[PDB]
């Protein structure tokens, strides 16, 4: 249901999603992507 | 116009912990005794070091600073003389009365990390050995190789300077307050108000007696002088419900030692030093 | 008043437009709010007085307290040649000339 997930579960999911985002892209990724795109193409 | 007559009663006494009550004295005497035992009692500690091999990840000054803070047994602190007052020698290595030489040597030849604690610190004098509590105070951590060899000496010093010769630790005293209850305004209060008043105290200083349905005073020494119950009584509408005032002539001492000297010995040394200072000041 | 044309003074045009209502307007106290051209209409002294009043108002707005003699000395120094010269180099050069 809409409210079946709960409030604390959504908070934990937000924290986990933030952690995953920081683990994947990292603090700096725009410069790395821009430099990699310049080399390849 | 004459001297006072202090009274001392000891509640708990151990090797490093002592809690005794001082009575019939002014707060000035207690404060002076605390200051003397926290900043004037001399002990022995490492102040000068001389290293030979140091290939660790830490700096030499860092190791020296953490070596100088290691507590040492100071049973001879009162008998030993100061380095500046020693005219027999300028001070180099082992000394008869002032300097005690310490030798340390650690070499790691295994894959596991070697922890250099305070247990492997040898001295010529067996009476100035470091205090052992456990695994001891860790100095550095060594990987494969990375030898560390040094030579250090210890001198008698006052706790006023460098804050490493002070054997005291959290010497406290309270006025031992007395709780006064009018016992007539409590009857006007309802049952729910009594519970609210009891829960208003930050610490467990007031108790509830089920058989009499009235508040009682249990452990009055844990009031901490937090004006919370009085404020709650004022808010409820009773200004003179509970009156709490400190006692000027009663005190409770709490002396905790760092292991250098015993707490009772610390108090005796503080008293002797205060007497010596007063004699010196005497004209 | 608009300043599109500088050929004619604004006060001169204002006087002509107030002919039917000369009695209503009290001309004994009316004066332009400007400082530079007020000396050409009511003399150097009137311009100096208005400058002193404006300086006092500015000091009061600034929140500080300044004695009267300082402001009077400033006014007398900035109008020693009969005109209020600017604080730029040209004004000082003209005053010295």
């Amino acid at each position: 249901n809409l409210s079946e997930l709960g409030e604390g579960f959504l908070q934990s999911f937000c924290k986990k999603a933030a952690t995953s985002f920081f683990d994947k892209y990292g603090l700096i990724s725009h410069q790395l992507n821009s430099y990699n795109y310049f080399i390849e193409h | 116009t004459y001297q006072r007559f202090p009274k001392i009663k000891i509640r708990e006494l151990k090797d490093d912990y002592a809690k005794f009550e001082l009575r019939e004295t002014d707060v000035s005497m207690a404060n002076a005794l605390r200051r003397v035992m926290i900043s004037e009692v001399p002990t022995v500690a490492i102040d000068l070091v001389e290293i030979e091999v140091n290939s660790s990840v830490l700096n030499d000054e860092f190791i020296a600073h953490r070596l100088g803070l290691i507590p040492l047994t100071s049973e001879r602190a009162m008998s030993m003389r100061f380095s500046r007052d020693c005219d027999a020698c300028d001070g180099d290595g082992q000394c008869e009365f002032c300097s005690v030489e310490f030798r340390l040597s650690s070499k790691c030849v295994t894959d596991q990390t070697l922890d250099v604690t305070s247990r492997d610190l040898y001295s010529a004098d067996p009476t100035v050995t470091p205090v052992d509590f456990h695994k001891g105070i860790i100095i550095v951590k060594l990987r494969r190789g990375q030898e560390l060899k040094l030579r250090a000496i210890a001198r008698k010093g006052i706790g006023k300077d460098h804050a490493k010769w002070s054997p005291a630790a959290t010497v406290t005293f309270m006025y031992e307050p007395d709780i006064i209850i009018n016992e007539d305004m409590m009857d006007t209060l309802s049952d729910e108000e009594k519970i609210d008043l009891i829960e208003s105290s930050p610490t467990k200083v007031f108790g509830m007696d089920p058989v009499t349905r009235q508040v009682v005073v249990v452990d009055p020494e844990a009031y901490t002088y937090d004006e919370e119950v009085i404020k709650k009584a004022e808010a409820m509408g009773k200004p003179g419900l509970i009156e709490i005032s400190p006692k000027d002539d009663s005190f409770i001492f709490t002396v905790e030692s760092t292991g250098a000297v015993k707490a009772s010995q610390l108090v005796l040394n503080a008293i002797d030093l205060l007497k010596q200072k007063l004699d010196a000041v005497r004209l | 008043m608009y300043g599109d044309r500088g050929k004619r003074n604004c006060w001169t045009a204002l006087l002509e437009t107030c002919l039917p209502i000369m009695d209503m307007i009290d001309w004994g106290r009316s004066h332009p709010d400007n400082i530079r051209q007020c000396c050409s209409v009511y003399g150097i002294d009137a311009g100096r007085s208005i400058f002193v009043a404006n300086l006092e108002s500015a000091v009061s707005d600034t929140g500080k307290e300044i004695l009267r003699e300082h402001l009077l000395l400033v006014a007398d120094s900035l109008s020693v040649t009969g005109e209020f010269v600017a604080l730029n180099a040209k004004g000082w050069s003209k005053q010295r000339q």
Partner: protein, 62 residues
């Protein structure tokens, strides 16, 4: 960075309690219970033993 010895505030010997604290944390113990099991009644020692960061491991590794 090894555990700071002597606990600058109030001067308490806590230089030999880091290994015990780590061992207690390894089990099913919270920070408060672990600090209480080390006989620390003042919050200065608890702050000193709670805010420390183990940095010497990275120094040895790198």
């Amino acid at each position: 960075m090894i555990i700071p010895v002597r606990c600058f505030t109030c001067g308490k010997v806590i230089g030999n309690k880091w290994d015990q604290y780590l061992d207690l944390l390894q089990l099913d113990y919270t920070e408060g219970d672990a600090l209480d099991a080390l006989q620390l009644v003042r919050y200065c020692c608890r702050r000193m033993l709670m805010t420390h960061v183990d940095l010497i491991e990275k120094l040895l590794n790198y």
